[PDB]
């Protein structure tokens, strides 16, 4: 839900390409609907990878 999305990107978990996003007012372009991914060591990324038990930990997340 979008409230949870503002929770996550206000806690600073996501990035678009390289740079992290802290404010929810950043709207994206047509180009950057593909590199919307969390940062690494984001523990939600860690918990979903360990849910699928594809949790690789050599890549530090």
């Amino acid at each position: 839900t979008i409230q949870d999305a503002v929770k996550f990107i206000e806690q600073g978990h996501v990035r678009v390409g390289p740079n992290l996003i802290n404010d929810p007012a950043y709207l994206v372009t047509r180009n950057m609907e593909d590199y919307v991914t969390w940062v690494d060591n984001s523990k939600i990324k860690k918990t979903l990878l360990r849910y699928r038990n594809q949790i690789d930990d050599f890549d530090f997340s």
Binding site: T37, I44, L48
Partner: peptide, 21 residues
Amino acid sequence: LREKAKERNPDEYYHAMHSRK
């Protein structure tokens, strides 16, 4: 089912993936 599978989008996060494993 195969179409959902190949459009999985592996950033699929919910809150129930601490009861499911």
